[PDB]
Ligand SMILES: *[C@@H]1O[C@H](CO)[C@@H](O[C@@H]2O[C@H](CO)[C@@H](O[C@@H]3O[C@H](CO[C@H]4O[C@H](CO[C@H]5O[C@H](CO)[C@@H](O)[C@H](O)[C@@H]5O)[C@@H](O)[C@H](O[C@H]5O[C@H](CO)[C@@H](O)[C@H](O)[C@@H]5O[C@H]5O[C@H](CO)[C@@H](O)[C@H](O)[C@@H]5O)[C@@H]4O)[C@@H](O)[C@H](O[C@H]4O[C@H](CO)[C@@H](O)[C@H](O)[C@@H]4O[C@@H]4O[C@H](CO)[C@@H](O)[C@H](O)[C@H]4NC(C)=O)[C@@H]3O)[C@H](O)[C@H]2NC(C)=O)[C@H](O)[C@H]1NC(C)=O
Ligand SMILES: *[C@@H]1O[C@H](CO)[C@@H](O[C@@H]2O[C@H](CO)[C@@H](O)[C@H](O)[C@H]2NC(C)=O)[C@H](O)[C@H]1NC(C)=O
């Protein structure tokens with residue numbers, strides 16, 4: 013904007029800095045990435061969804077997350093991060109299943125299928141009873 | 146009232162179709178707040194002091210989670226009608242002579258299916274709503290930089306709150322609105338809800354018009370005029386999305402309320418509340434432990450007050466949205482899937498048919514009513530009978546016994562209650578009733594029901 | 599003491615706004631309601647207005663709830679007197695009970 | 696007072712919005728006068744009532 | 745400090761007044777709609793309910 | 794057979810407590826009157 | 838740490854809040870028993 017090294021948002025939060033090296037840096041609080049947990053009581057299993065975050069950025073930003081999340085992100089496991097329309101998710105497998113009732117909704121007509129005592133991503137699609145011409 | 150026998154009644158001679166617009170909200174924006182981050186911002190000294198106010202954060206989280214769960218249940222209940230609603234396929238563009246092009250979703254030969262109708266596209270383009278970064282908002286807020294119109298969305302990752310996505314994507318809402326459009330046509334003389342008749346839209350409209358006091362002869366003569374008036378009424382509401390429209394203004398009011406709640410939540414973090422600074426780091430850097438506690442406590446108290454106010458208003462709006470959603474279900478069942486005999490519930494005038502389209506955070510209704518424009522003063526009678534030792538008196542059915550004029554030898558006719566068109570009295574439009582003192586005595590001219598053949 | 603609440607407007611710093619309509623408009627509204635009670639009863643629409651007297655409208659309303667025409671003709675004066683007694687009894691019904 | 700934010704402006708806006716909504720609500724109820732057909736009643740006695 | 749204590753007390757009073765005023769406005773709007781329904785059903789017609 | 798049913802009333806005997814005579818009365822007031830086609834309809 | 842005291846006054850089970858996401862959920866809502874659902878959780882893991 014001008015000859016200023018600090019960038020502030022409308023609410024006076026420091027969001028950007030210009031450094032001596034010549035780079036520009038985005039400034040965020042040490043806990044910024046939203047985290048939500050999908051838990052199933054019957055099987056005592058859980059999964060993690062990072063809302064509105066690209067999977068690639070989640071790999072770089074690990075210091076906010078818990079120890080097991082850090083270990084799983086570093087381990088590059090097979091059930092690793094999957095990009096959905098509601099953010100990056102861990103512990104899910106992409107399936108083409110279609111359901112009409114959901115107990116663990118994720119938004120945008122997405123559903124989570126708990127494992128029988130990983131989680132499966134299903135979709136909510138409704139069907140009319142009959143069509144009469 | 147007239148001084149002769151009988152009574153004067155104003156019967157319309159010309160009519161037009163009026164449209165009443167109504168907006169009903171169904172859901173609000175779901176918000177979750179990270180209480181620990183919002184209050185203490187990761188500083189252990191603040192968190193130690195926060196314990197003296199009890200388990201504040203856990204209660205805040207539980208209350209917000211319960212509110213979101215209730216809203217999800219409420220919206221799920223409304224959309225469940227799709228599973229058990231019988232529907233019939235409508236024609237493209239013209240269904241007889243009525244034009245329903247704008248209310249239908251345009252079919253595409255190749256590509257991605259559309260989820261918005263022409264009228265819905267017109268409605269949504271008139272309302273400014275920020276995109277709440279459902280998929281990649283966190284990255285976009287960094288790649289785009291600080292923007293005044295987008296600071297409310299990007300404040301999620303600084304203040305410590307999250308905007309949850311809605312339960313259903315817009316494709317589900319489009320399916321719901323298309324389901325409503327395909328269930329309007331049906332039978333009208335049945336006394337149940339267990340049978341579905343595949344009656345065309347035009348015949349259903351004509352049956353609805355015949356039940357409000359318009360005879361079959363008038364409908365047959367004025368078929369094209371009625372169709373043209375209906376098309377003119379439907380086409381006139383495409384350009385009715387202006388600031389003068391109160392119903393359209395309430396949609397923007399709902400959007401502004403949703404924005405205002407997050408604006409209030411975000412702005413409270415910049416207040417000092419009487420402390421030397423609004424930042425915990427500044428307090429720790431400028432003061433020593435004996436004096437830091439008081440300033441940190443002042444900030445804690447201010448932020449706790451802000452969170453309590455936000456939670457209370459969020460619960461209020463959730464309850465109001467649930468009641469409004471129930472009202473929407475009642476409006477759909479009464480005005481959309483059937484014809485209403487009530488006054489004032491489905492628009493003004495005599496109700497004929499209603500349509501429902503998707504709207505931001507709710508539904509938009511178009512109530513079509515029968516609106517007369519001109520009237521005629523007609524002389525009417527309570528009943529008619531001959532002069533015999535036993536009398537047989539008759540009364541009109543759904544109409545009036547009137548004389549054929551606009552201003553002992555009088556000739557009586559029958560007319561519909563909603564349109565003036567005299568026609569001979571038969572047993573179709575009359576029924577036998579008991580003897581009444583105010584009934585006319587017909588000496589010479591007798592209708593066939595009154596003839597002792 | 600009874601007026602300190604009103605006079606506190608100019609000391610505390612709040613204002614009581616007048617209502618949108620004066621009482622004459624409200625009187626016009628109530629008179630409008632009284633003049634629309636009478637009308638037809640056997641029609642299936644809301645687009646026609648019939649200038650039926652109040653007494654005939656009341657008798658039509660009574661005939662539709664299960665009272666035959668012969669009973670109404672025989673008991674006309676009794677029905678009118680009972681209605682007048684019912685209307686006049688509510689003038690003194692503004693009590694704490 | 697500035698350290699508590701724009702308190703007074705928010706208070707004024709909230710009260711103004713509430714009053715505006717009440718004015719709209721009362722205006723809607725009284726609009727029936729314009730399109731209500733009426734007939735003149737008699738003074739005192741209308742028949743026997 | 746003393747001026748701040750007075751400011752905090754009066755801000756709390758104003759917030760409480762605004763909240764209750766909005767509550768009563770919403771209740772009055774719903775009651776007004778009920779009045780319109782009562783007029784249309786009981787006053788201008790005969791009710792079968 | 795041709796069976797009839799009352800319209801907006803009841804088919805009652807004229808008493809307050811093979812040769813019985815049936816009448817018609819309104820549902821909201823007891824006043825027996827002869828049964829005609831005005832106050833009756835054919836049913837199954 | 839989240840500690841549960843039995844009827845006799847002893848600690849029967851405990852939760853390390855910063856271990857995994859399930860522990861974070863339990864400490865965020867302060868309950869060992871949590872119903873099935875989707876919950877937003879806070880952060881309890883500290884780093885140098
Ligand atoms: C069972 O039910 C299932 C769920 O209902 C259903 O599955 C769904 O199917 C539909 C239809 O097939 C899918 O819709 C499509 O979604 C595409 C992806 O959307 C996401 O991503 C975009 C951004 O794109 C980036 O990411 C995608 C991958 O995700 C990538 O492919 C792309 O390259 C980019 O990298 C994002 O914009 C979307 O989010 C916005 O839109 C949502 C609604 O669709 C909103 O809910 C959300 O809030 C976002 O809203 C904002 O942005 C929009 C757009 O600017 C604004 O209008 C709005 O105001 C707001 O700002 C989402 O995260 C999407 O790309 C695709 O788009 C096409 O189709 C629509 C509708 O016709 C057009 O509007 C688009 O322009 C575009 O049309 C044309 O599409 C063809 C073919 O793809 C392209 O070749 C053309 O170029 C393109 N034309 C133009 C001009 O762009 C469409 O929306 C949906 O995702 C599925 N949901 C799932 C799988 O969960 C399933 O079919 C049902 N099954 C049965 C049997 O019925
Ligand atoms: C993976 O998930 C997607 C939904 O996100 C499934 O649907 C496919 O999505 C891709 C990418 O948008 C489209 O190009 C395909 O056409 C979609 N297919 C269908 C049938 O809708 C996809 O099938 C999933 N893959 C699996 C389960 O292997």
Ligand SMILES: *[C@@H]1O[C@H](CO)[C@@H](O[C@@H]2O[C@H](CO)[C@@H](O)[C@H](O)[C@H]2NC(C)=O)[C@H](O)[C@H]1NC(C)=O
Nearest residue numbers: 157158159160161367370374377517518519520
């Ligand atoms: C009902 O009113 C309409 C609108 O005024 C009348 O339409 C007019 O029709 C005449 C021919 O009869 C045209 O010359 C006029 O231009 C029309 N007026 C318009 C379009 O505003 C219609 O005739 C009336 N119907 C009646 C009297 O039965």
Ligand SMILES: *[C@@H]1O[C@H](CO)[C@@H](O[C@@H]2O[C@H](CO)[C@@H](O)[C@H](O)[C@H]2NC(C)=O)[C@H](O)[C@H]1NC(C)=O
Nearest residue numbers: 238239242243244245246247248263376380383
């Ligand atoms: C039915 O109404 C639609 C609009 O709702 C009409 O379509 C328009 O037609 C005009 C004249 O050709 C075009 O200029 C517009 O672009 C069309 N609008 C659309 C497609 O949205 C249609 O012509 C009407 N049908 C009939 C039979 O009159």
Ligand SMILES: *[C@@H]1O[C@H](CO)[C@@H](O[C@@H]2O[C@H](CO)[C@@H](O)[C@H](O)[C@H]2NC(C)=O)[C@H](O)[C@H]1NC(C)=O
Nearest residue numbers: 548549550551556557558559566567568569570
């Ligand atoms: C009612 O009276 C009207 C006129 O007031 C009649 O309409 C006329 O009918 C005659 C005879 O068929 C025609 O020559 C005229 O052109 C008609 N006038 C108009 C303005 O249409 C009508 O036929 C009468 N209805 C009856 C007797 O049932």
Ligand SMILES: *[C@@H]1O[C@H](CO)[C@@H](O[C@@H]2O[C@H](CO)[C@@H](O)[C@H](O)[C@H]2NC(C)=O)[C@H](O)[C@H]1NC(C)=O
Nearest residue numbers: 150151530532536580581582583584585586587
């Ligand atoms: C039709 O004729 C009958 C005759 O039965 C009239 O009924 C009389 O009405 C007057 C008041 O108008 C009563 O005082 C008489 O007692 C009635 N007579 C009988 C025998 O019941 C009736 O008024 C006439 N209808 C008219 C003039 O419209």
Ligand SMILES: *[C@@H]1O[C@H](CO)[C@@H](O[C@@H]2O[C@H](CO)[C@@H](O)[C@H](O)[C@H]2NC(C)=O)[C@H](O)[C@H]1NC(C)=O
Nearest residue numbers: 806807808809814815816817824825826827828
């Ligand atoms: C029904 O029965 C009552 C008596 O229970 C009849 O009323 C009597 O009718 C006779 C003959 O006209 C009169 O002399 C009596 O004074 C009447 N009694 C009373 C108390 O009014 C009545 O007529 C019968 N109804 C019929 C046969 O339809």
Ligand SMILES: *[C@@H]1O[C@H](CO)[C@@H](O)[C@H](O)[C@H]1NC(C)=O
Nearest residue numbers: 141142143144145233234343
């Ligand atoms: C009735 O027709 C529909 C198509 O219109 C068909 O799907 C359905 O099976 C038919 N029902 C019966 C009972 O034959």
Ligand SMILES: *[C@@H]1O[C@H](CO)[C@@H](O)[C@H](O)[C@H]1NC(C)=O
Nearest residue numbers: 289290291292293294295296
């Ligand atoms: C600043 O406000 C103006 C006027 O509303 C708007 O056009 C412009 O985009 C805004 N600038 C930014 C960076 O948001």
Ligand SMILES: *[C@@H]1O[C@H](CO)[C@@H](O)[C@H](O)[C@H]1NC(C)=O
Nearest residue numbers: 599600601602603604605606
């Ligand atoms: C004081 O109160 C009494 C009793 O209510 C009342 O009659 C009197 O008018 C009051 N006095 C003033 C000055 O308001």
